[PDB]
Amino acid sequence: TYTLVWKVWILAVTLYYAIRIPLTLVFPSLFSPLLPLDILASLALIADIPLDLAFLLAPSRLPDLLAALPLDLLVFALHLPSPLSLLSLVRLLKLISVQASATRILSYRINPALLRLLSLVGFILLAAHGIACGWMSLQPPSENPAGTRYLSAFYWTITTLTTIGYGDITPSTPTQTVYTIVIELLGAAMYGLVIGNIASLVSKLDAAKLLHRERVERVTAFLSYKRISPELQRRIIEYFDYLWETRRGYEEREVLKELPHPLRLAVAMEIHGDVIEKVPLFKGAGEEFIRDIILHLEPVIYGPGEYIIRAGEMGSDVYFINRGSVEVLSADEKTRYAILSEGQFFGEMALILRAPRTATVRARAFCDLYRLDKETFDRILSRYPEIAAQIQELA
Amino acid sequence: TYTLVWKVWILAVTLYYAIRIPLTLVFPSLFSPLLPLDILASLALIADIPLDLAFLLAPSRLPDLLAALPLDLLVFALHLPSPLSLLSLVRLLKLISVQASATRILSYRINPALLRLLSLVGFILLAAHGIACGWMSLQPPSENPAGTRYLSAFYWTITTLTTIGYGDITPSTPTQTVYTIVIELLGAAMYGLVIGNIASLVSKLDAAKLLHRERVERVTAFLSYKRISPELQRRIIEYFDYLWETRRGYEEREVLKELPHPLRLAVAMEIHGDVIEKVPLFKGAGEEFIRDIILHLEPVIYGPGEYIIRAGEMGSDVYFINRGSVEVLSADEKTRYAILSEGQFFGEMALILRAPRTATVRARAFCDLYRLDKETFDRILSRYPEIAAQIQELA
Amino acid sequence: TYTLVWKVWILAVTLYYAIRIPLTLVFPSLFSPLLPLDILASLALIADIPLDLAFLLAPSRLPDLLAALPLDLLVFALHLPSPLSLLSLVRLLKLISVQASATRILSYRINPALLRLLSLVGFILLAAHGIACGWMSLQPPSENPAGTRYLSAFYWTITTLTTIGYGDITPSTPTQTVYTIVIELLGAAMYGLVIGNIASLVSKLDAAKLLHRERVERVTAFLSYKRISPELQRRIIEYFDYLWETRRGYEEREVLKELPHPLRLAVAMEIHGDVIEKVPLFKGAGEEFIRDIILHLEPVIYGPGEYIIRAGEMGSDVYFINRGSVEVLSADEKTRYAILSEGQFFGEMALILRAPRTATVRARAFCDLYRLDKETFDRILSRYPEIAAQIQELA
Amino acid sequence: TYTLVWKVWILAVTLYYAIRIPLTLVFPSLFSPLLPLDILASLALIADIPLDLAFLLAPSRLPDLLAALPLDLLVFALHLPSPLSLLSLVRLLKLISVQASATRILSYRINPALLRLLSLVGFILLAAHGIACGWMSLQPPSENPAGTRYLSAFYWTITTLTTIGYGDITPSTPTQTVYTIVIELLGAAMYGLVIGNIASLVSKLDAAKLLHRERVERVTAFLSYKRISPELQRRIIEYFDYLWETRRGYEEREVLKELPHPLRLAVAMEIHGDVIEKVPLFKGAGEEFIRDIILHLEPVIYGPGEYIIRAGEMGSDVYFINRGSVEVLSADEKTRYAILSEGQFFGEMALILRAPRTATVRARAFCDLYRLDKETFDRILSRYPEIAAQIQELA
Ligand SMILES: Nc1ncnc2c1ncn2[C@@H]1O[C@@H]2COP(=O)(O)O[C@H]2[C@H]1O
Ligand SMILES: Nc1ncnc2c1ncn2[C@@H]1O[C@@H]2COP(=O)(O)O[C@H]2[C@H]1O
Ligand SMILES: Nc1ncnc2c1ncn2[C@@H]1O[C@@H]2COP(=O)(O)O[C@H]2[C@H]1O
Ligand SMILES: Nc1ncnc2c1ncn2[C@@H]1O[C@@H]2COP(=O)(O)O[C@H]2[C@H]1O
C-alpha cells in the first residue's frame, strides 16, 4: 500500500506545480517564501523515476524525465525575460504520467466512462487557472490588489469557456483579441468534449431494462399478428414480469456458458446439492454417476395453474423442484393426494419403464424446476453397466 | 390505491417546502400567515416513516428521517442569523426519497429514458427557483416591490443556466462574482445533462426499422457482388417489403424461442388449432399425437407465382396453408383443378409412401404456410405403434 | 399519383395559413386583399376529410376536423379583441396531420433519422416566424415601417433560439421578461433536440467499416497473445483486406440465411448455373439431383500460394472454381500440367472412390471457390438409386 | 509514391485558392503581385483531370472540370462588378474532390470517426475565413489598416460560430442583420455537427472493457439469485480477472471461427507445433493424421488448486499443457510424483483403453491447456486403418 500512498504524494506535488508555476510567472514577488517547498518538491519529483524503474528514452517514459530536471529554480533565480522563461511549464508534463497512473490503478471499481469525465473536469479547471493567469499577464499595469484582478480574470475565463459570454469583459488590444480567439476555440472544444462524455455516460445506463422491454415488445408485436387470445397474451406478459422481477430477465442457459467446465460443474454441484442425494434409485452409486447426471438437468419454468403431467399419458421425464410448489391430484382433479415443495421430486417412475402416468401434477405458483429426459438418461447409463444392471433388477 | 393517493400527498408537501423555504429565507415577513400549513406539513411528513416501515439508520433510509425532524419552526421562530439558519434546507433531502419512489412505482408503463428526463427538468426548474432566491438575497437593499425583484432574479438565472448570456444583468461585487462563477459551472453541467439525455432518448427511437433497413442493405450489397439478375433482386426486395409490412421484419423461428415450453406449446396449439383437427389420417388418434406433431411444423413463405410442388418428382413433405391462397394445376399448367385457401392442406399423400407427385401447386400471393417433413414424421411415429400400424394399413 | 400531387397542395395550404395567421394577427390592415385566397384555402381544406375517409372522432383524426371548420373569417371579420381571437391558430393543428402523412409516404427511400431532422428544422423555422410575430405584437406603438420591425423581431428570436445572446435587444417590461423567459426555455429545448438528432444521425454512419475494423483488431489482439509469426499475421491481415475490398467483410454463410428456401434455391441456382451442367458423372441425371446438390456446396477462400490438394493423400472432396485461378503441378512442383480458371472444376475422382490424389493443386490468387464433401454426397445419393447404380458402374 | 506527393501538391493549391480568392474579392490592390503564382496554380489544376483519367460528365466528376476552367484571371482582369464576379468561387468546388481523395487514401490507418472530425474542423476554419471576408466586405468605407479590420472581422465570426456572443460587435444595417441571421444559423449547425461528431467518437472508445464488465455483472447478478457461496463467487471473479488480464476477455472458440479453413489450420499448426511431435503412440504416422488431430483439440482453463483427474475414475481424455504448470500426486495427495510444465502432456493411457486412472492431477496456477476426447479420437481413427491396427497392437 506504500505505492498507493506515494502516488498520492506525487499527485499532490504535480498539483502544487500546476497551481504555483503560472501564478508565479505573473507575480514575481513570490518564489522567495516558497523556496523550501519547491526544493522539497523538486527532490520528491527527481527521486521518482528510479522507483518507477524499480517496479529510459521510451515513447511512454519521456514525460517522466523531462518533468524532473529543474528548469525552474533557474529561470526564476536568474530573472530570464518573458519569451524564454515560458518553458518553465515543462513540469506540467508530469500530469500526463499522473493521469496515466490514475487510469490504471483505480480502473477496477470505477466505470471507465466516469473516470474519464472526472479527469476531464479536473483538467478543465486546472487549465482555466492557467488561462486566467495568462489573461491577467497581458493586461495594462494597474494598482488594483492581486486578488481582485485574479477574480476578474477567473470570471472572464469561466464566462468564456462555458460559452455564455456576458460581454462585460472584452478585449481592447490586438494581442488580447488573438488570445480571446484562440481560447474561444479552446472553450468550444472543451465544452464539446464534456457534452460528448456526458452523452456517452447517460446512453448506457439502463441496458438490461431496455433489452427486456424491447424483447417483450417484439414478442407482443409478433404475437398480435397471429391473432392470439388476450388471456394467453396476459399470461405471457405476467411470465415476463415475473422473470424480470426475479432474475432481471437473464436466460439461464445463455448465462451458464461463459464459465469453463470446472467452474460450471462446481456451480451445478452447489445448485443441485441435496436434491439428487436422496433419490431412491440413484443410491448405491458413486460420485461420477451423480456428477454426470447433474450436468444434464435442464431448467424450465411453469406458471400458476399450468399442467405439468397429465394422468394416463406415457411420459418419459423426471422433475426436480427448485424454487416453487406443486400439488398432486387424481385423474378427475377432485382429490388432492399430496403437496411437494422445494427439494423434492416427482415422476421418478418414468425412468424405470414407459408405463403410463398415475396422477396429475399442477403448479401452484411459478415453479422454476429442473427436468431430466429418458434418452439422455439411457445414453449416460450405457457407460456404467453396474448401475444399469441394478436398474434392470428394479425394473 | 391508498398508497398511490398518499404518495401524491407527500409529493405535494415536499414541493411545498421546496418552494416555501428559500423564499421565506429571503422575505421574513412570511411564515406568520403560513404556520397552519407548515405545522400540517410537518405532521404529515413525520407520520410517514412509520408507514414506510409498515410496508432504521440505513444507507437508503437516512434522508427520510433527516428530513422529518423540525429544523424549521425553530430557525424561523428564534430568528437565527444568516450563516446558521441555512440548514433549514434539510427538508429538501426528502426530494431524493420522493424521486426514488417515483422511479419505481411509475416505471412500468413509461420509457426509462423519458422518466429520467422529466425528473431532470423538474429538478432543474426547482433548483432555478432556489438559485433565483439566493441571487436576490445577496443584493443591495432596495425599495422595489418583491415581485419585480423576483422577476429580475428569475430572468437572470434562466438566462445564465441556458448559456445564452444577454449581459444586461451582471455581477457588481466580489461575492456576486463568486456566486456567478459557481452557478455558471452549475448551468453548464445541467445543460450538458439535458443534451445528453435528449441524445440518448432520440438515439434509440427507430430500432426495428433501422435493423430491417441494414439487413436489407447487407443482402443487396452481397447479392450484387455475385452478379445476380435485376429480376431476382426485385423479387427479394419485394419479399422484404412484404415482411416489413406484415410483421415488422421479425423472424418467426428466432421470436418463438424466448418462451418456455408450456407457453410455446399453448401458442402453437392456438395457432394450428383447427387445421390438424380435420386431417383424414390423423383422425382416431389422441391428444398426445397431435400435441407432438404441432411442435414440429416449420414455417415458410412463398411469393406470388413461385412453385411449391412440381408434378412428377418424388416429394416427402406436407403443407398446411395459414394466411394465403394456392392453386392446383395439371402437369401442363393448362387445366386448373381447384383452389385452396386458409385452413386447408395439400400433399398428404407423401407421408403414406414415396410415390411421385400427381399435380402442380402454385402460389397466388404471399402464402405464409407451414410444412412437415417425412423423416421427422417417421421419428415421431416410431413411438406410437398403434398409429403407425394404422398408417401401415392405409399404405 | 394524384394523391401525391394533392398532398403537396394541402401542404402548400397549411404552410400558407402557418405564415399568414400570426402575421395577420399583428397587422390588421391585411386580410382584405387576401380574402380570395383564404376562401379558396378554406374550401380546399374542408373538402379533404371526405377524401381522407375515402381512402370520425378518433385519437388520430381529431386534428383533421378541428383544423377544418372556419374559426378564421369570423374573428377577423367581427374584429374580436386580443385574448379571444388567439384561437384562430387552430388551423395550425393541420400541420400534425401533414407531418404524419409525410412521415409515411416518403419513408421508403429516406433514412428515418434524416427525415426527422428535416421535419424538426422546418418546424423550428416555422415556429421562429410565429415567435417573431408574438414578440413584435407586445412592443410599444411606433411609427417604423412594418418590415424593419419584422427584421428586428426575427433577429431577436434567431439570436435567442441559437443560444448566442448578443444582448443588443433585451426586455424592457414585465410581460416582455416573462415572454423572454418562456422562449429562452423553448430555444434551449429546441437546440437540445437538434444536437441530439445530429448526434444520433452521425453515430450510425459507418457500421460495416467499424465492425470489420473491430473484428480485425480482436483477431490480432488474441493472435499476438499466442505468439504466432509475423508472416502468418501478415497473411491474415491481407486476407481481411481482400475480404473488405471485395464484399465489405460480409460472411457468405451468415448472409445467405435471411432468405426463405425458394429464394435461397433461386439464388444458388443462378450462382452455380453452368458449373455443374458439364460434370461428366452428373450427366444423365434429372433436375432434382442437381437442385439437391446445389444446396450443399460450401464456400471457402484460398489465398495466393496456399495448398489445396497434396499429391499422395487420400482426399474426399471436389472443388468448383468461381472467381479465381488455379495451377496443377506434379508431385515435385516442377512440371506444370495445366491451369484452371472460372467455371471449371477439379478433384472429381475422389467422389467415385477413395484412391490417393494424383497431382498437386496451388492457388495463384485469391480463389473464392466452392467445395463438396463425400459423406454429404453419399447421404444425398442414397435416395436416388438409379444414379448411385450408374456411379457404381463407373467405379 | 509519386501519386501521394502530387495529391499533396493539389491540396496545397486548393488551399491556396481557398485563402486567396475571398481575400482578393475584398482587396483589389492584390492580384497584381500574385499573378505568377495563380497562373502556375491554374496550370497545375487544369493538368490534373487527364492524370485522374489516366488512373467525363459523371455525377462524381463534375467538380473536377468545373473547378479547372479559369473563371478567375477574367473577373479580376476585366474588373467585373460585385454581383457577377462572385462566381469566382467556383474553384472552391475542387475542395470536394480533395476531401473525396483524402477520405479514401488515408482511411487505412486512421479511425473513420476521427478523419471526419479533422475534415470538419478544417472546413470550419476555412469557411470562417470566408465568412470574415464577407463580413468585412459589407462594412462602411473606413481608413483603418487592412489587418486591424481583418482581425475585427475574424473576431466577430469566431465569437458568432462558437455561440458565445459577447455583443461588442453587432449589426448596424438591414443587410448586416440578414447576414448575421443566416450565419447565426450556420454557426449553430456547425457547432451541432462538431458536438455530434465528438459524442460519436467518445461513445465507442472502450468496447472490450465495457463488454467484459457487463458480462461479469450479468453472471454475478444471476449467480447471487441462486444463493451460491462467497468463495465460489470469488473464484469466478478471479477467473474473469485473469481472463481480462491475459487475453482481454476474448473467447478462443468464438475468435477462431472468423478465419477460413486453411488459415485456421495454419494457426493451429503453429500453436500445437512441438507438443504432438513427441507423443509415443502417434509416432510412425504421417502428416495427415497429425493435421486431422490438431483440428480437434479443445481448450479449457483450470484455476489454481482445481482437480483435473481423480485417481480411480474411468476417464477417457488426454490433456496437453500449453501455458501453465501441473503437479502429479498419489491417491492420498501426500506423495508428489512429478511436475509437468509447458509442452508436455498427461493422460495418454486413456486413449488405448478404458482402464481406471492411476494418479491425481492438480493445477498449480491457471493452466490454459488443451484436451482431446475418446469418441472423437475413435471416429477420426476409423479412417486410418494402419494406425488403428498399430494401436490395437499396443493395446
Ligand atoms: N400418493 C402420491 N404422493 C406423492 N406423489 C405421487 C403419489 N402418487 C403418484 N405420485 C407421483 O406422481 C407421478 C405421476 O406418475 P409417474 O409415473 O410419473 O410417478 C408419479 C409419482 O412421482
Ligand atoms: N383434384 C384435386 N383437388 C385438390 N387437390 C389435389 C387434387 N389432385 C391432387 N391434389 C393435391 O395435390 C398434391 C400433389 O401430389 P401429392 O401426392 O403431394 O398429393 C396431391 C394432393 O394433395
Ligand atoms: N493433366 C491434368 N490436367 C488437369 N487436371 C488434372 C490433371 N491430372 C490431374 N488433374 C486433377 O487433379 C486432381 C488431383 O487428384 P484427384 O484424384 O483429386 O483428381 C485430379 C484431377 O481432378
Ligand atoms: N510417475 C509418473 N510421472 C508422471 N506422470 C505420471 C506418473 N504416473 C502417472 N502419470 C500420469 O498420470 C495419469 C493418470 O492416469 P492415466 O491413466 O490418465 O495416465 C497417467 C499418466 O499420464
Author numbering:
A (entry chain B), B (entry chain C), C (entry chain D), D (entry chain A): 10 to 64, 76 to 415
In the authors' words:
Here, we used SthK, a cyclic nucleotide-modulated channel from Spirochaeta thermophila, to define a ligand-gating trajectory that includes multiple on-pathway intermediates. cAMP is a poor partial agonist for SthK and depolarization increases SthK activity. CNG channels are tetrameric channels where each subunit consists of a voltage sensing domain (VSD, S1–S4), a pore domain (S5-S6), and a cytosolic cyclic nucleotide binding domain (CNBD) that is linked to the pore domain via a C-linker comprised of four α helices. Meanwhile, membrane depolarization increases cAMP-induced channel activity, suggesting that voltage modulates the agonist status of cAMP in SthK, similar to its action on other CNG channels, although the mechanism is not known. Cryo-EM structures of VSD mutants with increased activity yielded cAMP-bound closed states (identical to apo and cAMP-bound WT SthK), as well as four additional states: one gating intermediate and 3 open states with different degrees of opening.
Similarly, the sidechain of Arg120, another basic residue on the S4 helix, points into an electronegative pocket formed by Asp61, Ser80, Asp84, and Ser117 on the S2 and S3 helices. Removal of the positive charge of Arg120 would also weaken interactions between S4 and the neighboring helices, facilitating VSD movements in the membrane. We next solved the structures of SthK R120A. Again, as predicted, most of the particles were in a closed conformation (799349 particles, ~76 %), virtually identical to that of WT SthK and SthK Y26F (RMSDs between the closed state structures of each mutant with respect to WT SthK are 0.4 and 0.7 Å, respectively). Again, similar to SthK Y26F, the R120A mutation does not lead to any local or other changes in the channel as gleaned from the identical structures of WT SthK and SthK R120A in the closed state. In all three open conformations of SthK R120A, the lower two helical turns of the S4 helix of the VSD are displaced outwards by a small kink at Val118, allowing S5 to move, which creates space for the expansion of S6. This lateral displacement is not observed in the closed states, which show identical S4 helices in SthK WT, Y26F, and R120A. In both cases, SthK Y26F and SthK R120A, the mutation did not lead to different protein conformations at rest but altered the relative stabilities between closed and open states. Importantly, at 0 mV, the condition on the cryo-EM grid, the extrapolated Po of both mutant channels is ~0.25, more than doubling the activity previously observed for WT SthK (~0.1).
